[PDB]
Amino acid sequence: GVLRVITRNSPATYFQDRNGETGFEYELAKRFAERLGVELKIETADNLDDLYAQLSREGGPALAAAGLTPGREDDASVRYSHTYLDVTPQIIYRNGQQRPTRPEDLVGKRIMVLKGSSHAEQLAELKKQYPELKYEESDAVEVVDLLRMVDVGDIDLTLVDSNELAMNQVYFPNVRVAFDFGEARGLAWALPGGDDDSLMNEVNAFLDQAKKEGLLQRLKDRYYGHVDVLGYVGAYTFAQHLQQRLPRYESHFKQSGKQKDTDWRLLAAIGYQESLWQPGATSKTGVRGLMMLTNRTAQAMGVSNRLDPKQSIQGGSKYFVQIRSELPESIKEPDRSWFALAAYNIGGAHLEDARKMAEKEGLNPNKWLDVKKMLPRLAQKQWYAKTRYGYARGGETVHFVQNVRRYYDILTWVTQP
Ligand SMILES: N[C@@H](CCC(=O)O)C(=O)O
Fold it and tell me: Subcellular location, in the record's words?
């Protein structure tokens, strides 16, 4: 009584954050496994070629959920469910470089795509029509890698499904859609063929029902797509809010500070980066209140009302100090505080991968200046594929810690002594 779903380890799909497992596919697979009264077991594939290999052996996974494009036709050997999400392939280029207008303008550019993907096949055929088109494909990269590579200019163009872009665009300021390339199409789950429609029919029953019940559109808004974390405000705006907001809460930050033997101004910085000192702030991610705590985490810290500024401040402060208390003793202050900010955001599991990765690189797993260099690698498959817990958006962790420290510095400077 265990549903095995194979997927890809990636932000649009499945990954681990500080609260455990998450992702569009993962949630859809879980709400489905529950509709079957079985346990969901995730298995992840290394690349797309391997996913389909795995799906087609006997004794393999039930189905594949991985934002797969059917394309197909009638290879009965692999069969597709109804679609649960409609997308469009898009050519992506780097801002301030020659924006291609037409398929012919893909000639002369360096292009990279997932090896074994629909899009590699979309380009393969375009190469008959223009034998000068050249492109590379790789198994050691995921779409998140491709966008970074354009953003940073290591490649000119790539070709990806629009949803992957909607989720990530914001983490890549320099990238821009050049044009749609192909008709809109639907994504779907993949099952092996196929003589018993036992398994297929309910999936199709599930997806059809979950479309009219709002579940698909709910998820789509949950994930696709938005900037949780980021945003250093003006020094202007912070000075503003020092006068308009902090006076309400300074009292609570101070006492929690005292209660827990920790600098109140860092607690106050966490909260500013968190919600901008807004006790009613909330996210579609399911965090809420001044210290943007999750429900499980709030209950765990004794917070019975997430919207009460005093409670959320006390519970968030409690959460931060414990995380800082649980790090390896080998990490000393002040780095220790920075690791905890790093862990507060990305989860200790991932932070741990970073330190191992840091060690193996001959760096100091105890120096925030070093591990901080490793955290961004967790969003690079060549690297995160080699870690225990896999993908993490480590660049956003770094911004988190940085930003929080920055507010902490201004606060110190103004307080006072
Ligand atoms: N097939 C990949 C995209 C491949 C590419 O970017 O070229 C996906 O599942 O989104």
Answer: Cell outer membrane
